[PDB]
Amino acid sequence: MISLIAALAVDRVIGMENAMPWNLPADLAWFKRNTLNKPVIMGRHTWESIGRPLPGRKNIILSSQPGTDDRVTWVKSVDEAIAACGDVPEIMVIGGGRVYEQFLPKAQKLYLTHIDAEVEGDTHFPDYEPDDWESVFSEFHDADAQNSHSYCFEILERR
């Protein structure tokens, strides 16, 4: 089981040169509940973006270059990333864009958070054909004092 988890804003935008301009504690909490104990796979940029290991999860970084941090496992290719993950019920892929574009056709489940935030970014979630995916779960939330924007949690299963 290979899953992708991501927060998508308007036009599939998942990143810009800097931190997204929003504040979604509930989203990050969701991220945590659904990643905990499972191994996570990420590209180098996303690693650099987080700037610290995600605790309680085997952390795996894609990069053509040699590793620069020993608190985390570094891999040189996708098949290897998958090998580094071992025999686990479910693998979590956590970005960024280049890494999603590669793992999507190899994935059975998407954890998507939809934020109606008009934000311009050079990085996007891949285009997923709504015909290939069945939406099995959905929960919407209003913005509030702790969260800057509306967000919808969604879980998609490949038909």
């Epitope: 998508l8 804003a9 308007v10 036009d11 599939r12 939809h114 285009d127 709504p130 919407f140 509306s150």
Partner: nanobody, 125 residues
Framework: QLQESGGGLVQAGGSLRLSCEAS????????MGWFRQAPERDFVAV????????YYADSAKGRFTISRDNAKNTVYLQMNSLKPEDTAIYYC??????????????????????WGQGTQVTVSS
């Protein structure tokens, strides 16, 4: 899939609310837009999937209001200071892509794959 309701004849300066029911998909997941055609399809207004975002054409800014009622799978276009230049057929349109995926498209009147048959709006002097 999409049925436009409301729409008839109204005197100048008059109001009139348009209605559009959409069946066949999960309503709350998709934006909804409005177009109008005069004997070329001009984009009028779009409301995002969550309702929190709205974009109005210049011809529509200030006068009109687009809103949605998920419990009734309907978007509405309220129209308030009508004039003979607004007279045309009005269509509801929906993006084929769910959520905010086609949003900048939809605001530019593109990225719509579903249309209604339209409702007539006539404004007399």
């Amino acid at each position: 899939q999409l049925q436009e309701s409301g729409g008839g004849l109204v005197q100048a300066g008059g109001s009139l609310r348009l209605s559009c029911e959409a069946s066949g998909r999960t309503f709350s997941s998709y934006a909804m837009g409005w177009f109008r055609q005069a004997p070329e399809r001009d984009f009028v207004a779009v409301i995002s999937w969550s309702g929190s975002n709205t974009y109005y054409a210049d011809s529509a800014k200030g006068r009109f209001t687009i809103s949605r009622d998920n419990a009734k799978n309907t978007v509405y276009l309220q129209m308030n200071s009508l004039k003979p230049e607004d007279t045309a057929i009005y269509y509801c349109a929906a993006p084929g892509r769910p959520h905010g995926s086609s949003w900048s498209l939809n605001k530019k009147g593109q990225g719509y794959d579903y249309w209604g048959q339209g409702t007539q709006v006539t404004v007399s002097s």
